[PDB]
Structure formats: structure tokens, C-alpha cells
Amino acid sequence: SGFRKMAFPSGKVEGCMVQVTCGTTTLNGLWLDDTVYCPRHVICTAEDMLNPNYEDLLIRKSNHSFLVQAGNVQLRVIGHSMQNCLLRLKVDTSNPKTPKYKFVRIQPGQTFSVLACYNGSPSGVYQCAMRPNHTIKGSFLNGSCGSVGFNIDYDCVSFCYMHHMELPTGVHAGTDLEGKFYGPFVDRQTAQAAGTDTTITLNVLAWLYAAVINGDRWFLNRFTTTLNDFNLVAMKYNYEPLTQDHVDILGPLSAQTGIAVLDMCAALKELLQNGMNGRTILGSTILEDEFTPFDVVAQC
Amino acid sequence: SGFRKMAFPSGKVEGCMVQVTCGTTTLNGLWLDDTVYCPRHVICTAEDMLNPNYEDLLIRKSNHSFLVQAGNVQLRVIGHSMQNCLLRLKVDTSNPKTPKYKFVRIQPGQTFSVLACYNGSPSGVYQCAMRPNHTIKGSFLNGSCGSVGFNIDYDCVSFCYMHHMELPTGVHAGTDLEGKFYGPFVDRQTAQAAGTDTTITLNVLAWLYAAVINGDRWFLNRFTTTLNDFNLVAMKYNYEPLTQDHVDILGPLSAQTGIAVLDMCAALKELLQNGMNGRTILGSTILEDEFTPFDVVAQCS
């Protein structure tokens, strides 16, 4: 019992974090095998960030420009390249702590653990979600660029995020481990705004099911809806439309409670057009959207 | 910026987790140097849990009754002793991955990280607080017993909690690493309730500061209060009394934000007496009390 946002154990990741320095910029890098991954903007100064020519800046660098420290050990950079918005540094040592891993791109609404790091030193771990507008609501301070997001399957670490920057609304943007940003963001000082965000309907539905499991009942009704009519109302209120896969993901929860997915959609539909109006659901007067069906099931 | 419930990196503890089996009871154990610590109710059968005499049940066991497994390796039990509600198993090999460590008994209102484990295998990590009523609001399922709470300071791991059971209400109860329970609980399968919980005032005030540091000051007001007048309201709303020592602990947050502690108390008083006026604070419709002043400084400095 108990609902808590849980992060995966971070030990396999902690073993891959290093500090990368170029000029006066220090940040975090990920040391896998004989490669170190970090945000390419470490090569920029303040004046460069305004409009950086990254090919040009990399051309003017040398192997010896890049300083990589793992704990007390200086690593020797023996090669450098750039893949999308990531720097890749070849070091003359293979990380003996390298776990089994893969690089995966994650989708909006999905969750992952973040090992916040400063000076190549892990500071803390927490769970968060990729928002529809391709940002995350993390907790990053200066020096945290390079911090990684990941999921764990068996002994295989799936890396899915590397932190690059904080937007002006206080949310966070980064890339997958191929260096491709999530969303339409770029590693430049240009005015950048995340698109207007939407609510992760799938997770709200999971939260509603959890609320029923825990005895909350007042939002249910006898009203009927089709998927299409539900999605039309959902989009009107800045909720994500429900997908086919989504309905099936909710199957277990519907069986467990005996409430059909579309009936729960009917309940949510009403909540959107009226409001909750000061009635609590699971103790809160706002709907939560960062708790997934996988979270509810595994903890119920 | 941003504000998040954050746990310590769990690497150093992960390498201390082992599995302990006695009969068909398997649960988690903590392997430091040549000792494995685990809850003593691993020695009990189904019958035994109802009215256990642990001295009696332990003396009937051998070293060979205990199967200790670290991943692939098997460790050999070469001794045992009971300490309060823990069993301390001596093993033939010392843990090569033993961190620098200390056992501390944390106080209500303090936070720690929990590494929830299953069959000696770490599953998740999260942060929580010792409740004033000596329970924790954790997330535990069957098989989690022996999962540990800890803090990390620099290079030293302070272990403070081992999980023993879930209460009827769904809250969790356990011991420090000398086996003494937090609270009035015992490791016996009978129905046990906690006392009435209170809200950790110090922590709520820290989190209001965090909210301000994160650019949300909507709940501030022009008023102030005396310590004594705040404490009458606290008492009415089931909050812990604020002391001068508590006020002192908030000094740095007060200094950083430029909001005096008693002025933040005024804001809190108004929040308690009127409600949150349909608004959120740091994304929450509830006043959060599981971040300490220390946790806030660490994350917002």
C-alpha cells in the first residue's frame, strides 16, 4: 500500500557520470565503454551561444581542449566528434562500470528517472514524465547540463534523456542519447517558448481508477460516451485525445474495478465541462497526470 | 529551478542488499562488512507470527537454517545473534562494496531515502519523512521487509530505518539499525494503530520558502505575527509548535528570500484559517510537510 512516485535505483547510472570541461564551462557527461557523451554547447562561450556555428567551433577545438574527469581520474581524450546536439569524446579507457544499456527515444506521457548531477557527481534521483509539449518539469540548477534520464529493465539501462537547458517558464528541455532534441528546441540563445501544454489524459484516467480503488465514487455517472465524442471534448479542454492503445492499456484497471473504459471517459467528460467544484478526488482538488496506469497497477 | 521530491543516489546502498531465507520465508537483508542485518520475523512460520517468543524460536535454529544470497554468490552463515527486532547474521565473507557508514536513529520530521527491495533485489528509491506518530507513509508491497532508509552525507551512508510491516491503515512501521522500533509497534501479527499524526510545521514553512524561491508568492501577505500567536493557531490546526530553534533553522531561507520567519508564519496562519483559495503551491492543493529546511536549501540554493 501507498502511492509514491518512485525512481529506479541509480547505481548503474552513477557509475557512468563524469565531469567534462571545455574552456571555462564544466558540465556532466555519460561515460559508456570508451565513449563520453555530453551536450555540445560545452564548446561554446557566452558570445557564441547567441548564434553558434557548431561545425566551426568544433573545427577550432583539439583533443586536448576537452577535459574529462571520473572521480579522481583524468581521462585522456583521443578523438572527438559531434552527433546532432551531442559531443562524443573518445577516451583511451573503457568504463569498467559500463552496464548493459540501450538508447531509446521516449514518447510524451511516459515516465523516466533522472539522476541530477553536478561536476560529474550525482546529487539526487527523481521520477518525471515527458510532457505532451516535449518538456519536462524537473529540478535542475546551474551545472546540471548533461544529467541523464533513464529507465531500467532487468539489468539493462535504457537511456532516454540528457539535459540541455531550462526554458523561460522554468521547464526543461533536452535530447535523446542520439542528440536529437525532444520537441522543436535548439541549443541556441534564441527566444524559445514551449508550446501550450496539454494534460496527459491516459494518466488522469489511471488516477480516476485509483480513486475508485480507494473508495472515491462521486464523479462516476450513468452517462454513456463513444471514444470519438470523448476525444472531441478532451481536445476542447486541452486534454490529449485517447488513443486505441490507450484504451487497451486501461483494460486491467477496468477489469479490477468493473468500470468500462468509456464509462470512466464519460465521468472525466463531465469533470472537464463542469469542474470538480471543490470536491476532492484522492484528497486533491486538481487532477494528477504524472501517475501512469503502470504506476497504479504495480502499486495497487 | 523547479521543485521535486528527490532521493539520494542509491548506488552505495544497492551493493549492500542481499536476500535472506529461512524456511519458505524470504526477505531483504543489509550486508555490511561480515554482518547481514534483517528483520527477525524471517525466523517465524505462519503460526509463530501470531504469538512469537523470539528467544525461544531463535535458539532452535542453526547457522544452516539461514540461506543468504548476494546476487549469484551464496554466503555462509557462521554465527548469529538477535538485537532487539533485528537478526544479525555473521557471514564468512566481508562485503567488498561496504560503504563508509553509521547507524543513526532519526527524529520525527526528518527525511530519508528508501530503497525498496524484493527478494534481495532493489526495485525503487524514494524520499519520505519520519511522521510525528512514528510511522512512514511509504509504498511497500509483500516481500519488501528489510528494505532500508538512509541519508548520504558526502561519502558516508547513515542508515536509519529498516522496514518491518504495514499497519491496517496502510502506513509503514519499522526499526532503526539497532532493531528498536520507531513508535509503540511490535513485530507481531496483531492489529496495531498509530497515534494521531500532526503536521510538521517547520517543513511546511521550508516548502513555502521553496515556493517563493521558485517565483510563486501569491499566498504572502502584509501581516506578521508573534511566535506565541502563531502557536495558538498551530495547536488549533493540529500543527507542531514552532520553537525559537526552528525559527533559527529557517534563518538562511529567510535571508535568501528576504521574508522574515514570522512573516512567513503570518502567511501560513492565513492559509490554515482561510484555505488555499482554489490555488496551488508548487503544484499542490495540500500543504506539504515532508521537505526539511535542509532539503530545500540543497535543492534551491
What's B239's DSSP letter? B
d(CA A22, CA A36): 13
d(CA B168, CA B245): 36
Q: Which amino acid is at B83?
A: Q
d(CA A142, CA A149): 17
User: Residue A11: which of B2, B11, B140 has the nearest Cβ?
Assistant: B11
The alpha carbon torsion through B85, B91, B95, B101 (nearest 10 deg) reads 30
Contact assessment for residue B139 and residue A2, using Cβ atoms and an 8 Å cutoff? yes
d(CA A205, CA A210): 9
Contact assessment for residue B271 and residue B278, using Cβ atoms and an 8 Å cutoff? no
CB contacts < 8 A (A, B): 109
Which CATH code, of 2.120.10.30, 1.10.3290.10, 2.40.10.10, 3.40.50.150, is assigned to A1-14+100-197? 2.40.10.10
- B171 class by beta-carbon count within 10 Å (0-12 exposed, 13-18 middle, 19+ buried): buried
A137 and B166: CB-CB below 8 Å? no
The CATH-assigned architecture of domain B198-301 is Orthogonal Bundle (1.10)
Same fold, A1-14+100-197 and A15-99: yes
d(CA A11, CA B48): 37
d(CA A213, CA A294): 15
Task: Please calculate the CA angle A48-A50-A53 and round it to the nearest 5 degrees.
Answer: 50
Coil vs helix vs strand at B77? strand
Q: Is A172 on the interface with B (CB under 8 A)?
A: yes
**DSSP string for B94-136:** --TTPPEEEE--PPTT-EEEEEEEETTEEEEEEEEE--TTS-B
Closest Cα of chain B to A21: distance in Å? 23
Contact assessment for residue B1 and residue A170, using Cβ atoms and an 8 Å cutoff? yes
Contact assessment for residue B77 and residue B61, using Cβ atoms and an 8 Å cutoff? no
Of B167, B171, B124, B177, the residue nearest B146 (C-alpha): B177
Which CATH code, of 3.90.870.10, 1.10.3720.10, 2.40.10.10, 3.90.1200.10, is assigned to B15-99? 2.40.10.10
Phi, psi of B215 (to 5 degrees): 80, 25
- Judge whether B16 counts as a catalytic residue: no
d(CA B121, CA B191): 29
Q: Which amino acid is at A66?
A: F
Query: Active site residue: A16, A145, A160, A265, which one?
Result: A145
Q: Map out the domains of chain A as residue ranges.
A: 1-14+100-197, 15-99, 198-300
Task: Please calculate the CA angle A77-A80-A84 and round it to the nearest 5 degrees.
Answer: 140
Closest Cα of chain B to A13: distance in Å? 8
- Which residues have C-beta within 8 Å of that of residue B148, sequence separation ≥ 6? B13, B28, B30, B114, B115, B159, B161, B162, B163
Is A198-300 CATH 1.10.1840.10?
Answer: yes
For residue B216, how many other CB atoms are within 10 A of its CB? Answer: 18
A11-45: b (≥16 Cβ within 10 Å) or e = bbbbbbbbbbbbeebbbbbbbbebbbbbbbbbbbe
Chain A residues with beta carbon closer than 8 angstroms to that of B6 = 116, 124-126, 139
Task: Please calculate the CA angle B295-B296-B298 and round it to the nearest 5 degrees.
Answer: 65
A115 and B9: CB-CB below 8 Å? yes
Longest dimension (CA), chain A: 70
Entry resolution (Å): 2.1
Contact assessment for residue A43 and residue A53, using Cβ atoms and an 8 Å cutoff? no
The approach used to solve this structure was X-ray
